[model samples]
Target: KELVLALYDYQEKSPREVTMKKGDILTLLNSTNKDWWKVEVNDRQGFVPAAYVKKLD
Candidate 1:
């Protein structure tokens, strides 16, 4: 599993269901070909744009 850090706030529409603020750390799930990455924040799962987050080592 990989970890990524949110670079900015992402307040998108429904189904995607994610409200990531700055410095909000998310667990990067589903390591495959896609722009949207599955993330778990505060025990809640949602999707986020990969471009808005950077993978952490």
Candidate 2:
């Protein structure tokens, strides 16, 4: 399992406008490498950099 956080404020920002609350379960998508991954929550999808997330496995 991986724990993640929302890096940038999407809604008040650009490109996407969705906010991910704390403890949200994000589904991991395909990644460019082992560390990084694409995630989706609600109706928004974006990249969650590996540096800001932790893997528990």
Candidate 3:
């Protein structure tokens, strides 16, 4: 899995989504969706906007 950093705050629209703040570190999971991707933060897993996160080396 890849690591990513949130570039903006995102409010979860559903229970299956994740709320993230700017600079939050997220573990990339599934990228099947072009816009929304599955990610894990602090052991919590959910979907977040792909555009709102940036890939980290």
Candidate 4:
């Protein structure tokens, strides 16, 4: 997985989601979904909106 940056804050709406704060660096996981992207940070893994994250690539 690669690292990414969060563009906005996202509160997990469910257990399957991960909470992210703006400017947080996260690990990228699954990218199969067009809207949701799976990511991990601080050992926690879950999906966050794709629009809220910016890829380092």
lDDT of 3 at 13: 98
lDDT of 1 by residue, 1-57 (tens): 578898999986788667788898888876474688888876878787878888898
Write down the worst ten-residue block by lDDT for model 3.
35-44
Candidate 3 residues lying further than 4 Å off, grouped into runs, are none
Count steric clashes of candidate 1: 0
In the range 1-57, model 4's lDDT, one tens digit per residue, is: 688899999999998999999999999998889999999977899999999999887
User: Against the true structure, whose TM-score is highest?
Assistant: 4
What are the runs in model 4 whose C-alpha is more than 4 Å off?
Answer: none
- Whole-model lDDT, model 3: 0.93
| CA lDDT of every candidate | 0.80, 0.52, 0.93, 0.93
Better model by TM-score: candidate 2 vs candidate 4: 4
What is the C-alpha lDDT profile of model 3 across 1-53, one tens digit per residue? 79999999999999889989999989999888999989998788999999999
When superposed on Cα atoms, how far off is each prediction in RMSD? 1.4, 4.4, 0.9, 0.8
* Pairs of residues clashing in candidate 2: none
Give per-residue lDDT, candidate 3, residue 47.
96
Query: Looking at candidate 4, what is the lDDT of residue 26?
Result: 96
TM-score of each: 0.82, 0.45, 0.90, 0.93
For residues 1-57, write the lDDT of model 2, one tens digit per residue. Answer: 344554443332335323455556666554566655666765667655544444433
Cα-based lDDT at residue 16, candidate 3: 86
Output the lDDT of residue 48, model 2: 54
